[PDB]
């Protein structure tokens, strides 16, 4: 019922493609991969990173608070 031939109505659209044996599999891989990755990470880093930053701060604070919770209070054994 839902196969190729009856998916959508498309008019006046031209597509050009070439054979995979005709073109390279890695056309300028590093020289255009690096700026594209940098663009994607600079468009998403402010939405993604600060929650995990404050997870790191909460994790370190909780671990150190537990460590000083196990620490001996020097105020005890001071009266006698």
Partner 1 sequence: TDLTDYLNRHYKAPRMVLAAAGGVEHQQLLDLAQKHLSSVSRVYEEDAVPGLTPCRFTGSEIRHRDDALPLAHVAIAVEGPGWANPDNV
Ligand X SMILES: CCCCCCCCCCCCCCCCCC(=O)OC[C@H](COP(=O)(O)OCCN)OC(=O)CCCCCCCCCCCCCCCCC
For the chain, after which residues does the C atom lie more than 2.5 Å from the next written residue's N, i.e. where is it broken? none
Q: Does 50 bind ligand X (CB under 6 A)?
A: yes
Q: How far is the CB of 29 from ligand X (least distance, A)?
A: 26
d(Cα 72, Cα 78) in Å, to the nearest integer?
13
Our CB check for ligand X shows the closer of 32 and 39 to be 39
Q: Does 63 bind ligand X (CB under 6 A)?
A: no
**Token pair recorded at residue 13:** 């659209």
Our CB check for partner 1 shows the closer of 20 and 74 to be 20
Binding site for ligand X (CB under 6 A): 42-43, 46-47, 50-51, 54, 58
């Amino acid at each position: 019922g839902r196969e190729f031939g009856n998916l959508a109505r498309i008019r006046h659209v031209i597509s050009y493609s070439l054979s995979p044996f005709e073109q390279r599999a890695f056309p300028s891989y590093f020289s255009k991969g690096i700026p594209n990755v940098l663009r994607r990470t600079r468009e998403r880093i402010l939405r993604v990173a600060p929650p995990f930053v404050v997870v790191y701060l909460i994790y370190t604070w909780g671990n150190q608070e537990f460590e000083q919770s196990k620490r001996k209070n020097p105020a005890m054994y001071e009266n006698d």
